[PDB]
Amino acid sequence: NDIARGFERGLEPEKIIGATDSCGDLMFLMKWKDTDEADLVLAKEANVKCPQIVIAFYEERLTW
Amino acid sequence: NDIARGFERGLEPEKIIGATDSCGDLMFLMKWKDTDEADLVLAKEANVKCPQIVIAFYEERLTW
Amino acid sequence: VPRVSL
């Protein structure tokens, strides 16, 4: 199933607010700049398009 | 919701392929007719727009 | 993974 197409909206990524692997490939729920909205994007694609936003997300989840 | 907007695509619902309450309000991942595409829709809205599809999903996974 | 428990 073609599920995560958030980036096709042509909006600017701001912050990842959640993540799931439950449909196969790792996805992030991406909040966009200047909106309340959010949409699933594939992680592999966010890695390339918004790597600092990906990193910031993984950073606030570090556990020991 | 900020997140579930699948019905705004104006495609015919065909089958629910997952569900989550992880954003408070229950959502379904809805697959549309004659495409491999799916999108999150609010359950409250699917209940009204495609009640048989909602029920068929609940029925497929009854446990005792 | 949901499962309606009755």
Residue numbers in the entry:
A (entry chain C), B (entry chain A): 111 to 174
C (entry chain E): 485 to 490
Give passages from the manuscript.
HP1α contains two folded domains, chromodomain (CD) and chromoshadow domain (CSD), which are linked by a hinge region and flanked by the amino-terminal and carboxyl-terminal extensions (nte and cte). CD binds to tri/di methylated lysine 9 of histone H3 (H3K9me3/2), a major epigenetic modification and a hallmark of heterochromatin, whereas CSD mediates dimerization and associates with various proteins through recognizing the PxVxL motif, also known as the HP1 box. In addition to supporting the establishment of H3K9me3 as a recruitment module for HP1, KAP1 contains a HP1 box (KAP1Hbox) sequence, which is recognized by the CSD of HP1α (HP1αCSD) in biochemical studies. Each HP1αCSD protomer folds into a short N-terminal helix α1, a central three-stranded antiparallel β-sheet, and two C-terminal helices α2 and α3.
The formation of a tight HP1αCSD-KAP1 complex was confirmed by measuring binding affinity of HP1αCSD to the HP1 box-containing KAP1 (KAP1Hbox) peptide (aa 483–493 of KAP1) using fluorescence spectroscopy. To characterize the binding mechanism at atomic-resolution level, we co-expressed HP1αCSD and a larger fragment of KAP1 (aa 468–496, KAP1Hbox’), purified the HP1αCSD-KAP1Hbox’ complex, crystallized it, and determined its structure by X-ray crystallography. In the crystal structure, HP1αCSD forms a homodimer (HP1αCSD1 and HP1αCSD2, colored pink and grey, respectively), also observed in the structures of CSDs of HP1β and HP1γ10,11. The KAP1Hbox’ is bound in an extended conformation in an elongated groove created by the C-terminal regions following α3 of HP1αCSD. These regions of HP1αCSD adopt a β-strand conformation and sandwich KAP1Hbox’, essentially forming a triple stranded β-sheet, with KAP1Hbox’ being oriented parallel to the HP1αCSD1 region and antiparallel to the HP1αCSD2 region. A set of hydrophobic interactions and hydrogen bonds stabilize the HP1αCSD-KAP1Hbox’ complex. The side chains of Pro486, Val488 and Leu490 of KAP1Hbox’ are oriented toward and buried in the hydrophobic groove of the HP1αCSD dimer. Characteristic intermolecular β-sheet hydrogen bonds are formed between the backbone amides of Arg487 and Ser489 of KAP1Hbox’ and backbone carbonyl groups of Thr173 and Arg171 of HP1αCSD2. R487 is located in the middle of the β-strand in the HP1αCSD-KAP1Hbox’ complex and therefore is highly restrained with its positively charged side chain being fully accessible for DNA binding. Interestingly, incorporating additional symmetry mates from the crystal lattice showed that the HP1αCSD-KAP1Hbox’ complex crystallizes in an oligomeric spiral form with a diameter of ~66 Å and the vertical step of ~67 Å, large enough to potentially wrap around two double-stranded strands of DNA. The positively charged side chain of R487 is oriented toward the inner side of the spiral and therefore may augment binding to DNA.
